[PDB]
């Protein structure tokens, strides 16, 4: 279960990090502002998943 | 929390359905008896001296 859940747990981290990366690569925001925007975007999606 | 569920009837219905399902599953597995373990335990020590 530990091994089987490795991908499941990295899913949320990948989602957040990728969202921040695309936000800062497209909108050009500062890293803190980009992180805030991404958390606002996907706060509920992680909870649902 | 009341205003939250007024705009979200589906959430409340889901919660009610979940409660009903859990209760229905519980009913078919709950033991049935007249009384719970009300009777105080008794321990009998028996020795014989012929």
């Amino acid at each position: 279960a530990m091994v089987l859940a490795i991908g499941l747990l990295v899913d949320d981290a990948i989602v957040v990090v990728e969202n921040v990366e695309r936000i800062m690569s497209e909108e050009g925001l500062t890293p803190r502002e980009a992180t805030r925007k991404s958390m606002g975007q996907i706060q509920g999606a992680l909870v649902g998943i | 929390m009341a205003n939250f569920f007024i705009d979200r009837p589906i959430f409340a219905w889901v919660l009610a359905i979940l409660l009903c399902l859990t209760g229905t599953l519980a009913i078919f597995s709950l033991p049935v008896e007249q009384y719970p373990d009300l009777a105080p335990p008794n321990v009998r020590v028996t020795a014989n001296y012929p």
Binding site: V3, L4, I6, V10, D11, V15, N19, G48 | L18
Partner: protein, 148 residues
């Protein structure tokens, strides 16, 4: 078959499975129930999340898309449906549900804002392709050593 054989015996002799056989006879029939109850719970959770009785049907239709692949992989390698397989199936169902959830939630939000349905779903797919492929490849290579 052994029960049939002992039935073929003269009267007065009966069988009682013991130890591993006893426990195996006790269990093994709880699978379909589990699957059904788990799927119902997932549908209800989706209905709560999306506030609809329709969007979950969109999500719940991708469970077979993972089930077929898991079954095909199991049969192709000649494995057997067992406890480990069942848990695998549940994990596959969950991951398929998550993959569906990303796209459907993004598209639902986009069309709720007012975007065209086709435009909303296309934009959601374009944005979420990289997370989906990234997470799925990470998971596949994660369980790859187990398979080999």
């Amino acid at each position: 078959i052994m029960e049939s054989l002992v039935k073929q015996l003269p009267n007065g002799f009966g069988l009682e499975w013991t130890a591993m056989s006893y426990q195996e006879r006790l269990s093994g029939a709880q699978a379909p129930a589990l699957y059904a109850i788990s799927l119902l719970v997932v549908f209800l959770c989706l209905a709560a999340l999306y506030e609809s009785w329709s969007v979950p049907f969109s999500v719940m239709l991708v469970v077979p898309l993972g089930v077929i692949g898991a079954l095909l992989a199991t049969w192709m390698r000649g494995l057997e449906n067992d406890v480990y397989f069942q848990v695998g199936l549940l994990t596959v169902i969950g991951l398929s549900a998550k993959n569906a959830i990303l796209i459907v939630e993004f598209a639902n939000e986009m069309n709720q804002k007012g975007h065209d349905l086709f435009e909303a779903t296309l934009h959601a797919c374009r944005q979420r392709l990289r997370p989906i492929l990234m997470t799925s490849l990470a998971f596949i290579f994660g369980v790859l050593p187990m398979a080999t």
